[PDB]
């Protein structure tokens, strides 16, 4: 991805040999920057609504004629708007992004009838998985605001048209916008973005209201969608060693109908539960999470105790083989993340919008057994353990028990 | 590089356009035949129908040329 600048907008493109191009606009407008709860999710759902030059309806009818597709999502850091199309249709897609950023008519009826209903179904579908809920609740406990804001719009806190209009005034601005083109000729993109996004406001960098704070605690969410539990450990010093740690600890099976050789995978033996170690680097802070979902709350309780033990065992001693396996699993994870268009866009988006140079999968550091033991020991000795039970919370473990 | 999709709006009225209607033209034709055959069949008994239409059809037309003998006719 050759980083450049076109009319004040950061543009990164990588040419390829395929008939299919992906163009993504990455916006610094994720939930950590949200003025009001849910506004970044609503803004994401407001992309490709009526603009002054082109109605939502006309856009969709024309997108179908090009056979293009549209993907949008919100993270804690970004809003990502992606289009996939045939190489030659690039100018149309650049112009459509420009119309969205400069000329979105934010009409009340679109919010009531189109945008908010779609945002609500989006959230209900995600929450069908209790593991999603548990990991969201864990961020809320650990950070409270900023990173602790909900990513998604909820019913209890309504977003108004004035909220979304204000936030869009901040976000849709040259300072908060990065363009990422996969299988796009870099010189052609720069020329097009330079003409289309020239009249976009400059604006200023969106910032998180307040400094990121680290907290501990519990989050009991009584649902009936299933049972899950996140054992989260908030990290004040984001380090790449936790990537190898998450990979090592593992949880998911490497092959069909197996359990997996990973410590966390060998804590589910005998039960019908599923574990997953995940590290969430957020630049200024971090979050190490072990999410156990399953049908039986008793089964989850068992695995949860084995999970914390596994972390302590790592803190004691990792073998050289285990350290090599962590490197291999972590290199592979990096590679596939840089391949997947959703995550690829945000990786370069982070490099362009912040200045955090991407770590190429081939440059992923090998951590010694000593380094991995150090990492796990720091997590075992965290003074702020966060627990987030979802489901039959009366039968799920508490922070003090673990 | 393609800047714009390439299309026109065809003329239309009450949600009908010429390409669609043109597909149905032959169907209206057959329905018209059906209605014609049906109508003619319904009035086949009417003497004028026989005199003016049916008796003039070649070969077949003699089916409708029938005379009551003067000896058998009170009127
Ligand atoms: C003897 C009995 C008579 C029954 C006659 C039924 C004739 C119905 C013709 C008809 O439905 O044509 C539809 C056609 C337009 O097609 P569409 O827009 O409904 O697909 O409509 C037009 O093309 C006008």
From Swiss-Prot, chain A:
PROSITE patterns: INSULINASE (PS00143). It comes from the Eukaryota. GO terms for molecular function: metal ion binding; metalloendopeptidase activity; ubiquinol-cytochrome-c reductase activity. Keywords: Electron transport, Membrane, Mitochondrion, Mitochondrion inner membrane, Respiratory chain, Transit peptide, Transport. It is a peripheral membrane protein. Belongs to the peptidase M16 family. UQCRC2/QCR2 subfamily. Component of the ubiquinol-cytochrome c oxidoreductase (cytochrome b-c1 complex, complex III, CIII), a multisubunit enzyme composed of 3 respiratory subunits cytochrome b, cytochrome c1 and Rieske protein, 2 core protein subunits, and additional low-molecular weight protein subunits. The complex exists as an obligatory dimer and forms supercomplexes (SCs) in the inner mitochondrial membrane with cytochrome c oxidase (complex IV, CIV). This is Cytochrome b-c1 complex subunit 2, mitochondrial.
